[PDB]
Design an enzyme around this catalytic site. Structure first.
Site, PDB file in Angstrom:
ATOM      1  N   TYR A  32       0.911  -1.118   0.000  1.00 32.71           N
ATOM      2  CA  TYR A  32       0.000   0.000   0.000  1.00 32.71           C
ATOM      3  C   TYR A  32       0.966   1.187   0.000  1.00 32.71           C
ATOM      4  O   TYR A  32       1.139   1.852  -1.019  1.00 32.71           O
ATOM      5  CB  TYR A  32      -0.859   0.002   1.248  1.00 32.71           C
ATOM      6  CG  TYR A  32      -1.832   1.129   1.159  1.00 32.71           C
ATOM      7  CD1 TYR A  32      -1.720   2.261   1.993  1.00 32.71           C
ATOM      8  CD2 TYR A  32      -2.828   1.117   0.164  1.00 32.71           C
ATOM      9  CE1 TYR A  32      -2.570   3.363   1.840  1.00 32.71           C
ATOM     10  CE2 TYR A  32      -3.701   2.214  -0.015  1.00 32.71           C
ATOM     11  CZ  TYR A  32      -3.568   3.324   0.816  1.00 32.71           C
ATOM     12  OH  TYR A  32      -4.402   4.383   0.591  1.00 32.71           O
TER      13      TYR A  32
ATOM     14  N   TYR B 284      -3.456   3.185  -3.747  1.00 28.74           N
ATOM     15  CA  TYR B 284      -2.099   3.778  -3.697  1.00 28.74           C
ATOM     16  C   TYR B 284      -1.139   2.630  -3.916  1.00 28.74           C
ATOM     17  O   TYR B 284      -0.061   2.803  -4.486  1.00 28.74           O
ATOM     18  CB  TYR B 284      -1.775   4.370  -2.316  1.00 28.74           C
ATOM     19  CG  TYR B 284      -0.606   5.326  -2.324  1.00 28.74           C
ATOM     20  CD1 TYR B 284       0.710   4.863  -2.251  1.00 28.74           C
ATOM     21  CD2 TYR B 284      -0.814   6.708  -2.451  1.00 28.74           C
ATOM     22  CE1 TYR B 284       1.805   5.749  -2.302  1.00 28.74           C
ATOM     23  CE2 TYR B 284       0.266   7.605  -2.519  1.00 28.74           C
ATOM     24  CZ  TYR B 284       1.577   7.114  -2.443  1.00 28.74           C
ATOM     25  OH  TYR B 284       2.624   8.011  -2.532  1.00 28.74           O
TER      26      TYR B 284
ATOM     27  N   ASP C 255     -15.387   3.654 -11.194  1.00 20.69           N
ATOM     28  CA  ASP C 255     -14.598   4.140 -10.074  1.00 20.69           C
ATOM     29  C   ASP C 255     -14.722   5.672 -10.095  1.00 20.69           C
ATOM     30  O   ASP C 255     -14.237   6.337 -11.000  1.00 20.69           O
ATOM     31  CB  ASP C 255     -13.123   3.768 -10.262  1.00 20.69           C
ATOM     32  CG  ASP C 255     -12.335   3.861  -8.971  1.00 20.69           C
ATOM     33  OD1 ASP C 255     -12.499   4.846  -8.204  1.00 20.69           O
ATOM     34  OD2 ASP C 255     -11.548   2.941  -8.709  1.00 20.69           O
TER      35      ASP C 255
HETATM   36  N1  LIG Z   1      -7.802  10.012  -0.316  1.00 19.67           N
HETATM   37  C1  LIG Z   1      -7.561   8.856   0.557  1.00 19.67           C
HETATM   38  C2  LIG Z   1      -8.334   9.143   1.844  1.00 19.67           C
HETATM   39  C3  LIG Z   1      -7.786   8.328   3.012  1.00 19.67           C
HETATM   40  O1  LIG Z   1      -6.505   7.883   2.952  1.00 19.67           O
HETATM   41  N2  LIG Z   1      -8.569   8.124   4.067  1.00 19.67           N
HETATM   42  C4  LIG Z   1      -9.788   8.924   4.271  1.00 19.67           C
HETATM   43  C5  LIG Z   1      -9.479  10.198   5.064  1.00 19.67           C
HETATM   44  C6  LIG Z   1      -8.840   9.941   6.433  1.00 19.67           C
HETATM   45  C7  LIG Z   1      -7.420   9.381   6.315  1.00 19.67           C
HETATM   46  C8  LIG Z   1      -7.377   7.857   6.188  1.00 19.67           C
HETATM   47  N3  LIG Z   1      -8.017   7.291   4.987  1.00 19.67           N
HETATM   48  C9  LIG Z   1      -9.054   6.329   5.392  1.00 19.67           C
HETATM   49  O2  LIG Z   1     -10.371   6.765   5.036  1.00 19.67           O
HETATM   50  C10 LIG Z   1      -8.647   5.109   4.554  1.00 19.67           C
HETATM   51  C11 LIG Z   1      -8.893   5.078   3.183  1.00 19.67           C
HETATM   52  C12 LIG Z   1      -8.250   4.138   2.382  1.00 19.67           C
HETATM   53  C13 LIG Z   1      -7.365   3.223   2.947  1.00 19.67           C
HETATM   54  C14 LIG Z   1      -7.129   3.247   4.321  1.00 19.67           C
HETATM   55  C15 LIG Z   1      -7.773   4.186   5.124  1.00 19.67           C
HETATM   56  C16 LIG Z   1      -8.096   7.715  -0.302  1.00 19.67           C
HETATM   57  C17 LIG Z   1      -7.332   7.141  -1.316  1.00 19.67           C
HETATM   58  C18 LIG Z   1      -6.054   7.589  -1.633  1.00 19.67           C
HETATM   59  C19 LIG Z   1      -5.398   7.187  -2.793  1.00 19.67           C
HETATM   60  F1  LIG Z   1      -4.098   7.496  -2.960  1.00 19.67           F
HETATM   61  C20 LIG Z   1      -6.062   6.345  -3.681  1.00 19.67           C
HETATM   62  F2  LIG Z   1      -5.670   6.194  -4.962  1.00 19.67           F
HETATM   63  C21 LIG Z   1      -7.303   5.836  -3.325  1.00 19.67           C
HETATM   64  C22 LIG Z   1      -7.934   6.201  -2.141  1.00 19.67           C
HETATM   65  F3  LIG Z   1      -9.105   5.623  -1.821  1.00 19.67           F
END
Ligand SMILES: N[C@@H](CC(=O)N1CCCCCN1C(=O)c1ccccc1)Cc1cc(F)c(F)cc1F
Ligand SMILES: N[C@@H](CC(=O)N1CCCCCN1C(=O)c1ccccc1)Cc1cc(F)c(F)cc1F
EC number: 3.4.14.5
Lengths: 726, 728
Positions: free
Chosen positions: B509, B593, B670
């Site tokens: 990740y 990611y 998506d």
């Molecule tokens: N924008 C990201 C938001 C995110 O990391 N969140 C939501 C906001 C709070 C921070 C933690 N995170 C959680 O909701 C979460 C989302 C996704 C994986 C693990 C945890 C989502 C995200 C990032 C990317 F790099 C992707 F390509 C895809 C994605 F969903």
């Protein structure tokens, strides 16, 4: 011992077929583009002259992709900034060069983004379409006259076809027809106002941040269709005064009662134009013959001159009603129409006499009328040797139908069984073009005696190269199914030993009125499969296929996805028992309709195929366009054929894909068979849990034809076939 | 000898983890949904009572998917006609049932297609959002009061977040916060008028003739961003007269100078609300503390109460500035913020005193503040044993910072190293939830003595089943890279013999502030890969990973696609020399990611990997949303960071995929990582002539989570891994 024809030889074009594309400019000479320079030839002796030098356009600054010389010989049209649209349409930029004064015309230039341009048939007038409107130029350097004022992108089309008329009826973007001496310019106008829009994402170059949404008026099965109007304008009355008056030619009343289509336009004389109309239910068509009324100014189509062509076994014509070929005075004409026995033959008509007389008959068909003189009518047919997959030029004596002479049959029977022809302006000479079973052979002949003047191109260069390589052979034959014969072909690997067992790939298309079993010589993906991979590549023409009579062609009327898919299965079943075919390794592939059929076969549950590939398949008829779909399926309403529309989807057979290995490929920018269709197949396969392979091609359309995409799809499919087979 | 944990066991859920989700309704009781009936439990003795019968709603005619009991106990909210939207948003229908009179309320019903509904924290008031507007209901059966009149689909959002605020800042659809006793209802309003729209085709069921075009206001990197406004309305002045007067709370002026975001709202007392604002360049944030002015009617935020939180090494906060936890009187608060040494710790603030005092310190971090009493502050941290991948509950004495007690550490050290907690209303009791390394264990405790009252769920059922199967083991350890330690984990096949050579799959990740190396017990696709296919599944936390201090986390500031991808390569390089790893059979995969990283690794030219799978990968940062991308990459303009935005695309590495076997997968619907991103990867691969495998999932989104799609993608990927590893 020697090499084979490899995948790279195919993708990189190492072995090229030479051609000899000429363009007749009179009854005695023709032009011959020679990459650098354009030459003019004297048909009688063969002597040439440089018409236009290669260097003439160096400091033009633009790469020219094509050029059109005025009937006059006085001007030349230069095409550049070519931007492709659909199968035939495109926009370009144009400059006209005056050959009288070796000058490049600089005034009153044709706009950039011109949609269509064409010289009149005589002299040097011009008609072009821009921003969906029609313009006429009497002289290359004079202001042009606007003919239509209603053009509007995606809504009103003047002089050019909308999406469905381009693809399905005229096979061209042009919707304008000049009269023989250029006095009249006839045109059609399409109103797409209520036609729904197909929408899909186009990603473009990496630099585009937000994907673009393309939208094109495209009527799917049973949806609202574009409407059409026909007009005729006199190009000698434009002078300068006011807006040109366009005279409309309407009806027929039997057509106006409901949805219909304009399906053919053919000038008969300077003042007589014929038009064929087709009802939305395509088993009934009407031809009107309209004459110019000099006192009235209008065009009248005498009901006495109206001819009806209909069908009770299916739709009318191979893909639309055929076109008429009028005699000099325009009072009679010859037309290919279906027999009482169901075979397409030439019938002679009097413009005002309802019943025609067939001049050819027999269980074979006239492919097309090639030239008409006051003496003879020249036509192409598959009569010779009774093989529907051969093509030969014949001439029939107009005063005595018993005198029919075959002109191509015996020229070189071993090497040539498939000809097409190209006559000079008054049929004084003709160029025969043989494209199989041996290497292409181009020849020039003079009609007076039909003697061969000379060989234009015999492809000897290619022949030297191919004898250093292990090329495959082709077998054209037949098998019998229920008292009727069906032809097939097999590309056999080199040194074919019927003792050994070979894997077999069924190459299928099988759409209505198609033909995959023929005598044409080809250098393609199948050549590579046979030559290098030692795979036998077969094709079979079953029910629905054409050039063999309506009993076989109309067998699938209102029944798409039934007999043509079952016959493909039966053919392979028969091939597997041949003895040189490995039961355990039989595969199937197809593109477009072939993809539809390939998918229906893999999901039939037959168990005959191990694996298969479908490229841009139709998956359910309600997704395809109206003009094509309806022609064979009727309307998708409960009162009509909705039940079969619903019974013939690939999705419904999802469960049976469990038994095979499947490769689904589709271009995302396919404007013809929308990615939608494969999107619904994958979603149905996912829903029942069957694993399969897939590949999408970003921004490629129905042809997946960009250089890199073409190379990549064949490479990908080659890996797939070799794996399923080794 | 015995079976293994198969792919079908994973897709069909044959071995399920039992949970114990409770909901505290007071300081002494909690509710416990029991599929059929909902029970209420007495924390002290454990005795329960049926609160609502299973049969209570048979002839309702609708399947209920959730329900919310008013703080009162007097009413129950029924959710049905649930239609999912993005990661948190959805619309539903609602019916209220009066428990006082066992009746289903039939008048002044909440509309169908309601976007969000919530009880006030006390009593039984309701606020709900419909057609983008806010409505308040003082009584469940009385007319509701329209609060906002500006809602307009895809343009003006009142009380609900637009796409980017939902995904990136609030992790919720709700944009409305009631005050503690329910007198005030605070809300945000988002204007997306100039936000561009992402458009993509949605095919729907076979019967749709013409595919639909979905369009959602979504600002990509550097584009126009939604604008925001905050308001507070008094729900005790709605009475009937006229349109409710909403009082706006604006600024700060240091925020109004340019683009900014509302990034947190936390009530402090009945009349004090705090708000955190973030500049579009996210290294600077400001907290305002606003008090209700009874004579004026407005809300004033005293500049003396303003606190600045900024960063010079990177962005602020793990994903946004953390939230304050106020003391009873609201004059002071505790907040996790970065150390001078770069470690996130708890610091104590006076609302009108600028400098704070850290109350915890050390090279470890406080994950979050869990509960604040006048005595103690309860928090979770990875301090124990110095392992960043463990989680324990601690309590620090507010009058003496030296008295910190670990409450979870020693309960069952062998089986439990990862806890999360759930306190009752006044922290009288708490439920500890252990999720690894052993099977999940749920326990109830009372705060007065911190003694364990009882085991709520020990998963003994699952334990009986798992001993009949050859389960894999997990190793959590570290390797050193340039004087600093980096943790990793490996799911090891059963009967692991370090003598034999195993193929290894790197599960990645690696996004900013992430963690793939931990003590959590999991039953997933990697369990199957190790147990049945005897593949070692590893995960490594390199630069950019979190919970280990800013030096490691901010290592990738403005440098995405650099060190986190390189460290993944270095880890695998080190694993390949371990002795039990087959050099020739190392593969890599990631989603989201992870997909981006996996693609950058396969296109690095390292040659360490034979093959790899990327699911819904980002391919170039200008395609992702502003709030997330910019947070780590700055603006994609030549004056700022455009050069790195262009240097870090997957497309530019196309040529190097020649060396590997690649599987690219993406959902066509998506809305998060637009299909666009993989469409550009495939087009670049085609242009340089590299063969690869692909799979699109029609109408699936970023989760590829419908039942059938989920099963199909894992099955497809399993075939791909086994073939690249030459098994089957
Ligand atoms: N924008 C990201 C938001 C995110 O990391 N969140 C939501 C906001 C709070 C921070 C933690 N995170 C959680 O909701 C979460 C989302 C996704 C994986 C693990 C945890 C989502 C995200 C990032 C990317 F790099 C992707 F390509 C895809 C994605 F969903
Ligand atoms: N509508 C079809 C028109 C067609 O068959 N043409 C053009 C009209 C004259 C008949 C011959 N045919 C040729 O243009 C041609 C089109 C496509 C393949 C081979 C030959 C095109 C077509 C049919 C399908 F069934 C497909 F799914 C895809 C397709 F392009």
């Amino acid at each position: 011992s020697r090499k084979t024809y490899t995948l790279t030889d195919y993708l990189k074009n190492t072995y090229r077929l030479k051609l000899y594309s000429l363009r007749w400019i009179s009854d005695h000479e023709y032009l011959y583009k020679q990459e650098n320079n354009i030459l003019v030839f004297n048909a009688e002796y063969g002597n040439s002259s440089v018409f236009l030098e290669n260097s003439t356009f160096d400091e033009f600054g633009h790469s020219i992709n094509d050029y059109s010389i005025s009937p006059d010989g006085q001007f030349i049209l230069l095409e550049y900034n070519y931007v492709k649209q659909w199968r035939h349409s495109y926009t370009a930029s144009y400059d006209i060069y005056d050959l009288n004064k070796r000058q490049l015309i600089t005034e009153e230039r044709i706009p950039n983004n011109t949609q269509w341009v064409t010289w009149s048939p005589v002299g040097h007038k011009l008609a072009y379409v821009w921003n969906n409107d029609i313009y006429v130029k009497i002289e290359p350097n004079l202001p042009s006259y606007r003919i239509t004022w209603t053009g509007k992108e995606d809504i009103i089309y003047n002089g050019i076809t909308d999406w469905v008329y381009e693809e399905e009826v005229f096979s061209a973007y042009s919707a304008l027809w000049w009269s023989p001496n250029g006095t009249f310019l006839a045109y059609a106008q399409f109103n797409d106002t209520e036609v729904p829009l197909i929408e899909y994402s186009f990603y473009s170059d990496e630099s585009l941040q937000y994907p673009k949404t393309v939208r094109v008026p495209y009527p799917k099965a049973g949806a609202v269709n574009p409407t059409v109007k026909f007009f005729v304008v006199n190009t000698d009355s434009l002078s300068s005064v006011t807006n040109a008056t366009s005279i409309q030619i309407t009806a027929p009343a039997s057509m106006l009662i409901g949805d219909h289509y304009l399906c053919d336009v053919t000038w008969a004389t300077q003042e007589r134009i014929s038009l064929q109309w087709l009802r939305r239910i395509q088993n009934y068509s009407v031809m009107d013959i309209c004459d110019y009324d000099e006192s009235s100014g209008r065009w009248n189509c005498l009901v006495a001159r109206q001819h009806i062509e209909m069908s009770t076994t299916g739709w009318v014509g191979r893909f639309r009603p055929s076109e008429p070929h009028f005699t000099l005075d325009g009072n009679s004409f010859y037309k290919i129409i279906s027999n009482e026995e169901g075979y397409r033959h030439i019938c002679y008509f009097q413009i005002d006499k309802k019943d025609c007389t067939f001049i050819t008959k027999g269980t074979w068909e006239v492919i097309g009328i090639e030239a008409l003189t006051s003496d003879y009518l020249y036509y192409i047919s598959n009569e010779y040797k009774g093989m529907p997959g051969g093509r030969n030029l014949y001439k029939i004596q107009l005063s005595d139908y018993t005198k029919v002479t075959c002109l191509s049959c015996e020229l070189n029977p071993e090497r040539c069984q498939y000809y097409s022809v190209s006559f000079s302006k008054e049929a004084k000479y003709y160029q025969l073009r043989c494209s199989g079973p041996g290497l292409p052979l181009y020849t020039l002949h003079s009609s007076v005696n039909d003697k061969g003047l000379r060989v234009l191109e015999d492809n000897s260069a290619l022949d030297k190269m191919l004898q250093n390589v292990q090329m495959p052979s082709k077998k054209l034959d037949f098998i019998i199914l229920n008292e009727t014969k069906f032809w097939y072909q097999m590309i056999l690997p080199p040194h074919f030993d019927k003792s050994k067992k070979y894997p077999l790939l069924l190459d299928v298309y099988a759409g209505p009125c198609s033909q995959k079993a023929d005598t044409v010589f080809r250098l393609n993906w199948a050549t590579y499969l046979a030559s290098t991979e030692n795979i036998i590549v077969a094709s079979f023409d079953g029910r629905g296929s054409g050039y063999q009579g309506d009993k076989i062609m109309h067998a699938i009327n209102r029944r798409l996805g039934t007999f043509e898919v079952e016959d493909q299965i039966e053919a392979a079943r028969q091939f597997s028992k041949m003895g040189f075919v490995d039961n355990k390794r039989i595969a199937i592939w197809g593109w477009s309709y072939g993809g539809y059929v390939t998918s229906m076969v893999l999901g039939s549950g037959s168990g005959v195929f191990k694996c298969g590939i479908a490229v841009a398949p139709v998956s359910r008829w309600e997704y395809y366009d109206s003009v094509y779909t309806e022609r064979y399926m009727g309307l998708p309403t409960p009162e009509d054929n909705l039940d079969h529309y619903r019974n013939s989807t690939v999705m419904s057979r999802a469960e049976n894909f469990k038994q095979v290995e499947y490769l689904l490929i589709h271009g995302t920018a396919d404007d013809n068979v929308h990615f939608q269709q494969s999107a619904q197949i994958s979603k149905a396969l996912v829903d029942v849990g069957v694993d399969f392979q897939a590949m999408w091609y970003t921004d490629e359309d129905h042809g997946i034809a960009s250089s890199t995409a073409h190379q990549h799809i064949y490479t990908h499919m080659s890996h797939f076939i070799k794996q399923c087979f080794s």
